[PDB]
Ligand binder design. Structure first.
Ligand SMILES: CC(C)[C@H](C[C@H](O)[C@@H](N)CN1CC(=O)N(c2ccccc2Cl)CC1(C)C)C(=O)NCC(C)(C)C(N)=O
Ligand SMILES: *[C@@H]1O[C@H](CO)[C@@H](O)[C@H](O)[C@H]1NC(C)=O
Length: 340
């Protein structure tokens, strides 16, 4: 592990507080893509030009055309990434990728199959896994791992900043610091919690409480920080409990409450690493109205991650929006500091 004296930031655009993506360049000349940086997975893919136009998701997204890159290097091994919400498939390809000014030779997947649901709802073109190599499908080396290998980053860590406001443009949707963290988006001190098992940004969850009582997971559970997840999530069971206390009316893909009821919803604290990270209703309730005739969805819902990783709580944007997060690959730890 060689540490340099560099840092690199990636400006992120905030889409409806559910999607945060930056741009990256691939091939020569560079072909730009909108990608979400996902600590949940570990691979890199962008929709490929060799993707049938019968997949409408490919018709609506930028497509990488290896035939246009002079730096491209063929591989072709079949690849499939099975996320808990959708799946993509294609083949491995190598080319130069430019991220935050940094340039690195990277092996990535060219997707030739992306189902309309959920990808037609994706404002980004692809993903950049920030997970560990151990979880990389096809044993493909994670982009960050390769970067670290250049011996230029200051620390074997990267931080995430997600802005609340999604509507303003003049402001920055978010920021990722490769090689450290940015003191301008957090205040106070960082409080760490080591990873449980290596190869996964997952940690011990000593309990989730909904306001008054500690009505959830008294025996403990795990929380996986997914900077590529729109919301916070618990096992279908746990959430039926958590919502019950909120009085949310469960629907097909989420829970809602009458808009008037929104403000008077109780806080929700996650006990992590010996600290209570509490959220107020305003932090997990898409207000958007105050009428009792209207419905307002919650930035929280059920999602059961299959084993070996699951079951587990997933802390996504809804959590990172309030708590600036540092990922420490050096000490298998995750720091949480109050965003600013
Ligand atoms: C384990 C789980 C937390 C993890 C979750 C996963 O990273 C997601 N955040 C990825 N995401 C799921 C999703 O629905 N995303 C999404 C968000 C809004 C609109 C459309 C989409 Cl497609 C974003 C992405 C980044 C595509 C997972 O399913 N990993 C796959 C696997 C387990 C195979 C792995 N590679 O480790
Ligand atoms: C793809 O890369 C892997 C890893 O180095 C290599 O073993 C494989 O042969 C490559 N694909 C081919 C056959 O070109």
């Amino acid at each position: 592990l060689t540490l340099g004296n560099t840092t690199s930031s990636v400006i992120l655009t905030n889409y409806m507080d559910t999607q945060y993506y930056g741009e990256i360049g691939i091939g020569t000349p560079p072909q730009t893509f909108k990608v979400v940086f996902d600590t949940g997975s570990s691979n890199v893919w962008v929709p490929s030009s060799k993707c049938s136009r019968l997949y409408t998701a490919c018709v609506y997204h930028k497509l990488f055309d290896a035939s246009d890159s002079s730096s491209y290097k063929h591989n072709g091994t079949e690849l499939t990434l099975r996320y808990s919400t959708g799946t993509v498939s294609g083949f491995l390809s190598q080319d130069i990728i430019t991220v935050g000014g940094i340039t690195v030779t990277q092996m990535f997947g060219e997707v030739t199959e992306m189902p309309a649901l959920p990808f037609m709802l994706a404002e980004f073109d692809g993903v950049v896994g920030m997970g560990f190599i151990e979880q990389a499908i096809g044993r493909v080396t994670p982009i960050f791992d390769n970067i670290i290998s250049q011996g230029v980053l200051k620390e074997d860590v990267f931080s995430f900043y997600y802005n609340r406001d999604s509507e303003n443009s003049q402001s920055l949707g978010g920021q990722i610091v490769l090689g450290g963290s940015d003191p301008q988006h957090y205040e106070g001190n960082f409080h760490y919690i080591n990873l449980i098992k290596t190869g996964v940004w997952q940690i011990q969850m000593k309990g989730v409480s909904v306001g008054s009582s500690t009505l959830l997971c008294e025996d403990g559970c795990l929380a996986l920080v997914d900077t590529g997840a729109s919301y916070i999530s618990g096992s279908t069971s746990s959430i039926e409990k958590l919502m019950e206390a909120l009085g949310a009316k469960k629907r097909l893909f989420d829970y809602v409450v009458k808009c008037n009821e929104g403000p008077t919803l109780p806080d929700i604290s996650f006990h992590l690493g010996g600290k209570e990270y509490t959220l107020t209703s305003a932090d997990y309730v898409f207000q958007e109205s105050y009428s009792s005739k209207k419905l307002c969805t919650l930035a929280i819902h059920a999602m059961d991650i299959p084993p070996p990783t699951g079951p587990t709580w997933a802390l996504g944007a809804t959590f990172i929006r309030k708590f600036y997060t540092e990922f420490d690959r050096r000490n298998n730890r995750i720091g949480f500091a109050l965003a600013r």
